[PDB]
Design a protein around this ligand. Structure first.
Ligand SMILES: Nc1ncnc2c1ncn2[C@@H]1O[C@@H]2COP(=O)(O)O[C@H]3[C@@H](O)[C@H](n4cnc5c(N)ncnc54)O[C@@H]3COP(=O)(O)O[C@H]2[C@H]1O
Ligand SMILES: Nc1ncnc2c1ncn2[C@@H]1O[C@@H]2COP(=O)(O)O[C@H]3[C@@H](O)[C@H](n4cnc5c(N)ncnc54)O[C@@H]3COP(=O)(O)O[C@H]2[C@H]1O
Lengths: 552, 552
């Protein structure tokens, strides 16, 4: 469960802190109310757990909060859930990294001045880790569970209305990672659905225990959220006095928050694939296992997290309502979808599932409404992003539908080709030119070599050296008055294409891609051919073949 | 002259300011010494002018300070001059933009807090202007000349030892733009050499007049360099009292400094071409007039100027010794090269050219030595960049020489090809697939279509739809258990390449590049083919042809 429960188990490092921050606007003595609200949050958690249990039972293939919110409501709610899951992933990496840096700064207060630099550094190291592709993502979660359990144990040993709703919303903001198991069902044992339901029940129990313990410890110690450190940090400090175990707790908390960010990065492509299978995201994302869109997606979430951690300054309190909205819109849409699927169907336990999902959906909608009407000064990014991202999804869907309409219809075959002319541009006669012209002669005749010379005498010397060469292909030296390569070439191209069309031939070009095993010679070599392809050979409907001449 | 004299004529906005800053460490009363040093700088200017006059006479083709410093000394000094000209261009854009922003902030003191933001904004707007490719670059220079001439006139109307060497160096740092005419000789009238010499003489006279007037006005007004504004700004303010004409002077000064930055950007590719013609810079830069390396070069100088304006904070005083070193190393190397060319040859006026170039070279070497031993805390970027850039130039030269050795030698022709097999991967039968397979059948037989299916039933449906299609090409459905596209494909590729080699055939692949006239659909369409080309078709020596299927 660890590799998937990272998000939810790490949420306790800031759930109680958010509750206390919202309850600190009244007075310190109001911290009493942090005890009921917490269990109230747990109540919602119950519903969510129960609700999502049904989802793993409902969709063994693994749908999370998108398939449920698309197959049940319709196109627009499904795309809204998808866009909100995307913003949930961006906020997951942002908030998890911000809280990890805040925990580190709590451990080492001298670093507190450099909060956003270490934050962007952590984002960048996670980006690099997820760009170059385990059991190293399961030890930190178990360490965090053990450390927090023993911290709760020793804390108990030592110990032995609108604003309330705002606190309830900001505390439910500690329930964000529950979607991970519903998204990653297909990664389980032989009974995937039952095993995933069991492990999500274990996740719910463990998260409830951790959150309740942290809240009761915060109540007992009478702690308050200092801008310098988290509430869990204060609990550990007041329980163990900044000893080795306190530093262990801080390091493990930071590690699990980094791990939660990593889970956000590694679970975004699951959303991208679920969307691109429905023609809403680019087809590059359809090949999930080959990691095609993985690099682009990691780049995008890394840059978005950087932007949302610099604009918001790394203060997790100012980013947590954005995260709560981004994770609770999919919650509401998913629970509403489960409710609608239940009412449309007639299963045996119809009434119980009805009531549970309806209660959960109402609670989640109430929470997100409060987040809207309370922290709008930090939730307006949702109101500017969801329209943009959903309109982008719909634009992609419209484009793919138009392409399908203009492509599925097979029509009359084109006119029969009676041969090809292969223009083989040459810089200087080398082994690469010899190989390319040999292959061109293999493909067809009329192998027209062309050299766009920049000097008349050099042109004559090159033509003489060509006449020395034994290849029997006609070569055309085009003189360019200034150091140009496109205009003479495209003039010759127009002439040769007109001649080929009159003789009914298909124009083809060879561009030997000189490849050297050094990974930085690509800027040096064959960078004058990408010019030709981009400029005058992808606008003419002309085949442009590349011969990978390797270097040794 | 304006489009080339922008740099030198804009240097007066900060030359006298630098002189006064260096002379302000003693006392305000030391500003008297700003009068002799200025004319002393003028003396050096004379030599430089004279020296570079000879260069336009020596090299009508246009060599500036690189060809002179390569054809006369040798490889290492020539590459040192090239690298130092590159750092001179980076510092030209950086310092010119920084001084322009400083002049703007002088005009509008409320903007002085946002100095580096407006600086990076100006760098970015010049980058955009020089990325998308006049007479709009000549009016600002003439306006600046007229404004400063009338300012000098009204200023005269109103008015009617180691540290000294440091001031002399920082004042000679106002002589930076002289290289522009020597670089852009070929852009002149029918007698290019004589006309360029005449216009550089006019440049020298005008720059001397402007600098002498500004220095004498600074002496007369007793002005001192305030961190808030330039010396020319103080002159204009004390002469015209922040009237409309003072704002005109400030705006025109900022405009000409922006224009100087633009000249740096637009003259860097001249250096890049002069280097790549000698195999020291990538061959992408050889095609100067077609603007191949222009985009990469503009990107590089823009980012380097951003780095050197953020690290140095936009303070032109802390960037001006870097600029002076970067412009005076090429000065010294060029004058030494002219001296050595004179001594090796035996021209009529041998002794005069000898003495002039020797005096200029000694003065320039002394200036750069003082810049080294005085402002090293801001000149260490040269000491970390010149080794890197010169070693990079030598690495490129070695790589190109090795490639020439391994390529110029034409060897025995490869074995004769007896035909080709064209693998034509297919996603779904469309018009694009029909066109690509028609072209493949045109090229050769054994048109092997392949479909890497992700679902068995979908595979059967696709095969049935193919059998419905009339094309007589064998199709292979490869089943991938997970959503992959490389591994099944490269296994099939290994098998088919082995079969082709046994039958002695050359493997070829077709990848129809779906092009839509929208400039942002490239992320959507045909992004699963770049995967194949990069992953398993540029490591196998397999021709990879792309068919530009346009969209309508
Ligand atoms: N003598 C030499 N010294 C060092 N490196 C050498 C070399 N001869 C070839 N190479 C390297 O091998 C690549 C093979 O270029 P090729 O001449 O086959 O094929 C050329 C030709 O098809 C076309 N092309 C480039 N310049 C051209 C020109 N001036 N006139 C006509 N076609 C040109 O672009 C292709 C690649 O051009 P690019 O020069 O970027 O790419 C060259 C260059 O990177
Ligand atoms: N039914 C449809 N709906 C919407 N857009 C459609 C479409 N059919 C084709 N296109 C668009 O046209 C491009 C032409 O792809 P084609 O199938 O010729 O050529 C394919 C094929 O040669 C290869 N390829 C991609 N997926 C493959 C797969 N699953 N199995 C085998 N080859 C594949 O890569 C080429 C380009 O793939 P990609 O899909 O990026 O590129 C596709 C896609 O962008």
């Amino acid at each position: 469960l660890a590799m998937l429960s990272s998000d939810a188990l790490s949420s306790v490092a800031y759930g109680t802190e958010q509750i206390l921050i919202i309850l600190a606007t009244i007075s310190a003595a109001a911290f009493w109310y942090s005890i009921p609200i917490a269990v109230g949050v747990l109540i919602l958690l119950l519903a969510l757990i129960l609700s999502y249990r049904q989802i793993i039972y409902a969709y063994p293939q693994g749908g999370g909060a998108y398939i449920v919110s698309k197959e049940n409501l319709g196109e627009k709610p499904g795309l809204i859930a998808g866009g909100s899951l995307l913003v949930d992933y961006i906020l997951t990496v942002a908030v998890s990294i911000s809280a990890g840096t805040d925990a580190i700064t709590s451990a080492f207060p001298a670093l507190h001045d450099y909060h956003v630099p270490i934050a962007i550094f952590l984002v960048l190291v996670i980006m690099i880790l997820n760009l170059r592709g385990a059991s190293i993502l399961a030890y930190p979660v178990y360490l965090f569970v053990v450390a927090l359990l023993v911290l709760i144990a020793v804390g108990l040993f030592k110990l032995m209305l609108f604003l309330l709703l705002k606190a309830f919303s900001s505390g439910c903001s500690a329930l964000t990672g529950v979607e991970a198991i519903s998204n990653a069902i297909p990664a389980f044992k032989n009974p995937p659905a039952r095993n995933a339901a069991r492990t999500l029940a274990m996740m719910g129990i463990l998260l409830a225990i951790l959150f309740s313990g942290i809240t009761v410890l915060a109540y007992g110690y009478g702690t308050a959220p200092k801008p310098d450190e988290t509430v869990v940090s204060q609990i550990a400090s007041e329980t163990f006095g900044r000893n080795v175990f306190y530093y262990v707790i801080q390091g493990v908390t930071s590690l699990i928050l980094v791990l939660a960010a990593n889970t956000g990065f590694s679970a975004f492509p699951q959303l991208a694939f679920n969307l691109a299978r429905d023609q809403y995201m680019p087809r590059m994302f359809t090949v999930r296992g080959d990691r095609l869109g993985f690099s682009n997606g990691i780049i995008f979430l890394g840059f978005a997290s950087i932007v949302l951690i610099i604009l918001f300054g790394g203060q997790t309190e100012h980013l947590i309502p954005l995260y709560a909205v981004g994770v609770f819109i999919p919650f509401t849409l998913s629970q509403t979808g489960m409710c609608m699927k239940w009412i449309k169907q007639k299963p045996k336990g119809w009434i119980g599932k009805m009531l549970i999902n309806s209660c959960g959906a109402l609670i989640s909608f109430m929470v997100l409404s409060i987040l809207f009407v309370t922290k709008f000064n930090v939730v307006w990014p949702v109101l500017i992003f969801m329209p943009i991202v959903v309109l982008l999804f719909f634009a992609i869907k419209n484009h793919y539908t138009a392409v399908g309409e203009q492509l599925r219809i097979v029509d009359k075959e084109p006119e029969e080709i009676k041969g090809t002319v292969v223009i083989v541009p040459v810089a200087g006669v080398t082994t690469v030119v010899q190989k390319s012209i040999h292959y061109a002669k293999s493909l067809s005749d009329q192998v027209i070599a062309v050299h766009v010379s920049f000097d008349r005498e050099q042109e004559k010397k090159f033509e003489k050296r060509w006449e020395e060469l034994n290849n029997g292909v006609r070569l055309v030296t085009l003189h360019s008055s200034y150091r140009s390569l496109v205009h003479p070439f495209d003039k010759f191209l127009e002439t040769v294409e007109a001649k080929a069309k009159k003789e009914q031939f298909s124009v083809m070009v060879l561009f030997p891609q000189f490849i050297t095993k050094k990974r930085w010679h690509t800027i040096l070599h064959n960078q004058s051919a990408f010019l030709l392809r981009v400029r005058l050979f992808w606008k003419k409907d002309i085949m442009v073949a590349t011969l990978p001449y390797h270097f040794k």
